[PDB]
Design a protein around this ligand. Structure first.
Ligand SMILES: O=c1cc(O)c2cc(Br)ccc2o1
Length: 268
């Protein structure tokens, strides 16, 4: 209000309207996200808040693969969230629009940081439920990726989920066919979609039928080890998908660049 200077709108959509901001007390770059109360299906508590705020609080202690919630405010018709903002930054969707299919070395660095971020969320008892390139920010100076948009997420549990409101083209075929999925294995499928998107420059599937068929065609030259990983993540049966430990032990994942080296070699 007077604690923050509001800058340009960055984007708006199913997540709300997000503005560039600066915290007056120390000039910290922030993003200020406004979520309308009547456009929020899911609520939790600590008084009643969006699920998105409960999930963010649970993942927002120190480890930085997740954009942190610095503060939040309630308004009569909305909540307002003050999030971290890397500067300069570009979401991975725009980065891929610009660069096309990514060199494997860069995809490996990005994919690995995504897996550390998602493991962190899961250690904190939070399931994101909408992992995709549009929900990943690149801190271009440090080469660090950051998950954003917990607005479709949930407390992690070990029983079946029967609701979903994240992105359909990343949703697994057990969701498409049965409206049921378990959290980790759905997550792993979306991570196979994401990895394909990074190395091919676009998502493999556009239509329910392709998702259900689960047959993956590579339109770009991609190494056999990368194809094997992506195809393992996109196994039709949830329990044939790798755990995070098996993805990270996969031979395509070895020798990851550090974020800083990644920014130097690939980001300028
Ligand atoms: O939840 C979000 C959504 C965003 O779009 C976003 C953008 C920047 Br930049 C920084 C943090 C952000 O967090």
């Amino acid at each position: 209000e007077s604690q923050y200077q509001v800058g340009p709108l960055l984007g708006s959509g199913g997540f709300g309207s997000v503005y560039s901001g600066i915290r007056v007390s120390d000039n910290l770059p922030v993003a200020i996200k406004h979520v309308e109360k009547d456009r929020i299906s899911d609520w939790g508590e600590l008084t009643r808040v969006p699920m998105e705020v409960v999930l963010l609080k649970k993942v927002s202690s120190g480890f930085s693969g997740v954009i942190r919630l610095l503060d939040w405010f309630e308004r009569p018709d909305s909540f307002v969230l003050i999030l971290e903002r890397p500067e300069p930054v570009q979401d991975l969707f725009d980065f891929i629009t610009e660069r096309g299919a990514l060199q494997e070395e860069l995809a490996r660095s990005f994919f690995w940081q995504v897996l550390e971020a998602v493991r962190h969320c899961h250690n904190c008892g939070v399931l994101h439920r909408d992992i995709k390139d549009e929900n990943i920010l690149i801190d271009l100076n440090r080469g660090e990726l950051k998950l954003i948009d917990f607005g479709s997420g949930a407390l992690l549990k070990d029983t079946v989920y029967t609701d979903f409101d994240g992105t359909r083209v990343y949703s697994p075929p057990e969701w498409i066919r049965y409206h049921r999925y378990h959290g980790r294995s759905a997550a792993v499928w979306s991570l196979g979609i994401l990895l394909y998107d990074m190395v091919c420059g676009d998502i493999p599937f556009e239509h329910d039928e392709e998702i259900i068929r689960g047959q993956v065609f590579f339109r770009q030259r991609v190494s056999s080890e990368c194809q094997h990983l992506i195809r393992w993540c996109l196994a039709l049966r949830p329990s044939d998908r790798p755990t995070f430990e098996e993805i990270q032990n996969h031979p395509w994942m070895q020798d990851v660049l550090l974020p800083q080296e990644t920014a130097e070699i690939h980001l300028h």
